[PDB]
Every structure is written in C-alpha cells, then in structure tokens.
C-alpha cells in the first residue's frame, strides 16, 4: 500500500503499479485464497499458492519469464509484485492487430519462448498454459516474457492426471485419457503456438479437431515450418520432438537477436 503506488486495472486481477523505492514500473496481481486450487510449501516451509513457489524457482535472472519481485499475504488473498516492461503488448493482441507473422519474426519469437520454457524446465517448473495470451512483448527490447504460472506444477517425469490450462492448447492424450507427460504436452502446446504465429490463429477449436490430428494451413507456410508444426502436433506423445530436436530443426537456424527483432519488426 505504502511500498507501491497502485494504478488502474490491466486484465482479470492485475493492476499497474510503481515501486515508491526507485519508481520502477510493476504489475500487482491479486489472487483470492478461496479461488486457489493447488498449494505449496516455500523453502522455509511457509504455506503459499503453487504460483508463488513456481515464480520464486524461475526468478533466477534469465528474463524470458516475468520475475516475482515480492509478495504479501492478506486475510483472504495473496498480492504478487511482478516486473512490468513499458511499452508492452501480449502476443495474442499483437497477432490480432498484425495477422499471420512473417516467418523471420515467428522464428525469433518462437525461439525466445523455447528458451523461456527450457529455463522453466531447468528450474523444475512446468508452465502447463503456454499460449499467445500468456506471452508479453517488450516492444523496445524485442524480448518475450512468459506470464501466469497459476495452472503450473513442479516438473516430474511421471504422468499428470490433473490440468487447469487452456483446452484448445491441450494435447490429444489429455482430451482422450485425462493423462499426459509434461515435456511432450508442452511440445504440443508449442505446436499450436507456432501454427497460431504463422497462420494468424490456432488450428483447433473442438475436441474432434484436437484428437483428429489433421493440420490444414490456412496461410502460406514454408515446408520446413510446416514439418516442425506437424512434428510438434504428432498424435502419439513419443513421436513428438524433444526441445533439442526443435531447436536443431532446419526452420529454427539463423534466429534474429532480440534487438535485431525490435529494430526490424517492432520499431
């Protein structure tokens, strides 16, 4: 209240903020205790929402994730203080405004998202809600940042039987069997994301389409990029590429640096 000046709302509950300390732009996320499904313990065994546990674990220094700067407990809620780049726009609004992205730009963005998801995995965190809505663009730096770990979990190599993520980005094995593994599920969602970037919208709206495993390109997409998307969207999890095989794919070579991407595509 006194440590930060609260501004107006952004999206639903996240508000614009300024840190009184040094006038740093922040985002102030409120989470209702009554609406929290999954709880964790901190390294000092304090009972907090899983979101805070996952945010603390990924808040190393690699800035492909929106870092948690601070948090507060209140009687009926938790307040998360997150970094706020300015100017910013989420990748969903960016794609709506600009339509199907050029392959060069899609390569830069998809690469940065891959580096951010690998970072999460390296820190033992599975995001479980990778989509254009959960990616912020710093328009000056040309840096993408992952947000909203509220559907996340600790990474494990054993099967998941729960999911609170976006259904249209969820894989066939979830729709059919209520069963998935983190990595192969994440690769599926990244297939949806890449299609979404180069085609201007997600390929599937209905369960029938998700489990169908037919990918129709509504926009001109190179054969190399079509192959990567088809491979990520393989029906059988074991047939999906590893993060290694994605980043070694011919389509992913000669990526633009963030600043190159800002200069050429965002300025």
């Amino acid at each position: 209240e006194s440590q930060y000046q609260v501004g107006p709302l952004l999206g639903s509950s996240v508000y614009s903020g300024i840190r009184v300390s040094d006038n740093l732009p922040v985002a102030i996320k409120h989470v209702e205790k009554d609406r929290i499904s999954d709880w964790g313990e901190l390294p000092n065994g304090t009972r907090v929402p899983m979101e805070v546990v996952l945010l603390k674990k990924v808040s190393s220094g690699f800035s492909g994730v929106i870092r948690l700067l601070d948090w507060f407990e209140r009687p009926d809620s938790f307040v998360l203080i997150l970094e706020r780049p300015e100017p910013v726009q989420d990748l969903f609004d960016f794609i709506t405004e600009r339509g199907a992205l050029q392959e060069e730009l899609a390569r830069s963005f998809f690469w940065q998202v891959l580096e951010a998801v690998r970072h999460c995995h390296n820190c033992g965190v599975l995001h479980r809600d990778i989509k254009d809505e959960n990616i912020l663009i710093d328009l000056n730096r040309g840096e993408l940042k992952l947000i909203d770990f509220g559907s996340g979990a600790l990474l494990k190599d054993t099967v998941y039987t729960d999911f609170d993520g976006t259904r249209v980005y969820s894989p066939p094995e979830w729709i059919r069997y209520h069963r998935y593994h983190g990595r192969s599920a994440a690769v599926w969602s990244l297939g949806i994301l890449l299609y979404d970037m180069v085609c201007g919208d997600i390929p599937f709206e209905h369960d029938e389409e998700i489990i169908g495993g037919q990918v129709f390109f509504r926009q001109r997409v190179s054969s190399e990029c079509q192959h990567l998307i088809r491979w990520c969207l393989a029906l059988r999890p074991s047939d999906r590429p590893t993060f290694e095989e994605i980043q070694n794919h011919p389509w992913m070579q000669d990526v633009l640096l963030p600043q190159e991407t800002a200069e050429i595509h965002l300025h």
């Binding site: 809600d129 809505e133 993520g165 976006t166 919208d201």
Partner: peptide, 8 residues
C-alpha cells in the same frame, strides 16, 4: 473464422 481468447 472468428479469433478469440480461451479461459484457463
């Protein structure tokens, strides 16, 4: 088609 957000 109609492009839209999808909730979590």
């Amino acid at each position: 088609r109609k492009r839209r957000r999808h909730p979590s």
